[PDB]
Amino acid sequence: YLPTITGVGHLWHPL
Amino acid sequence: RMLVLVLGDLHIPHRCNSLPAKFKKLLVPGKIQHILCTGNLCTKESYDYLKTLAGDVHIVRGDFDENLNYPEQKVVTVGQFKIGLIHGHQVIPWGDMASLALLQRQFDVDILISGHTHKFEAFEHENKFYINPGSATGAYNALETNIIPSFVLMDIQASTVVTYVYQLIGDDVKVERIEYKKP
Predict the structure, then answer these.
(1) CB of A7 within 8 Å of any CB in chain B?
(2) I want to staple B109 with a disulfide (CB 3.0 to 4.6 A). Which of B20, B82, B117, B177 is the partner?
(3) Are B177 and A14 inside 8 Å of each other by CB?
(4) Long-range contacts for B57-60 (Cβ within 8 Å, ≥24 apart)?
(5) Structurally, how many domains does chain B consist of?
(6) Are the CB atoms for B176 and B48 separated by under 8 Å?
């Protein structure tokens, strides 16, 4: 996961 | 599934000495299938680096690129998606929507990638998708008020592309994701 640019949460990403 | 790295306007070494370390740490050789580079590398060192990451590297000619032999534009097909690539300094006003839409139609592409502005974009317009990866080094340009480093990763499967944008925000990488479907 990485933190989202906008907001508080996180996002899974392919790298 | 095909992963496509999209980046450009590095301006190494005249404006920036290197890719941000945390971006470089994210790009593991062998992970990514295709690289689409908008240009302004501006030297062979950076082309050599991209070739260590993937076996299929495409690059178009920027207005500061030392290698003037890079094609001025390119169309590449990845899965179901035809993708257009141009650096974008040729479009006046820079980033002009009507001009980019004309390029979309003339290239006959589902996705049009351009650069030059050093501003990341990822948006749908009249059922086509437009990407600008920004500057992977945060290189200044003539106009903008200091630049956030960014690059894009496209995750393509069947008729869907999931576009990830990576930004170096302060000293940490953050991400945003946008989904697009071939109509």
Answers:
(1) no
(2) B82
(3) no
(4) B58/B34, B58/B85, B60/B85, B60/B86, B60/B87
(5) 1
(6) no
**In this structure, are strands B128-133 and B120-125 parallel, antiparallel, or unpaired?**
antiparallel
CB B120 within 8 Å of CB B147:
no
What ranges make up the beta strands (E) of B41-182? 57-59, 73-78, 81-86, 111-113, 120-125, 128-133, 150-157, 160-169, 172-181
B40 is in an annotated binding site: yes
Determine whether the interchain pair A5/B169 forms a contact, defined as Cβ–Cβ distance below 8 Å. Answer: yes
Closest partner residue to B174 (CB to CB) among A5, A14, A15 is A5
Query: CA of B40: how far to CAs of B13, B34, B117, B140, B149, in Å?
Result: 10, 18, 12, 12, 15
| Residue B91 · residue B73 · CB < 8 Å | no
Question: First vs last Cα of chain B: how many Å apart?
Answer: 19
Resolution (angstroms) equals 1.8
Structure-block tokens of residue B133: 């990866």
> B173 at the A interface (CB within 8 A)?
yes
Environment class of residue B143 by beta-carbon count within 10 Å: exposed (0-12), middle (13-18) or buried (19+)? Answer: exposed
Per DSSP bridges, beta strands A2-3 and A10-11 are: antiparallel
Structure determination method = X-ray
CA nearest neighbour of B116 among B79, B85, B155, B161: B85
Sequence letter at residue B4: V
Name chain A contacts of B177, Cβ cutoff 8 Å.
Answer: 11, 13
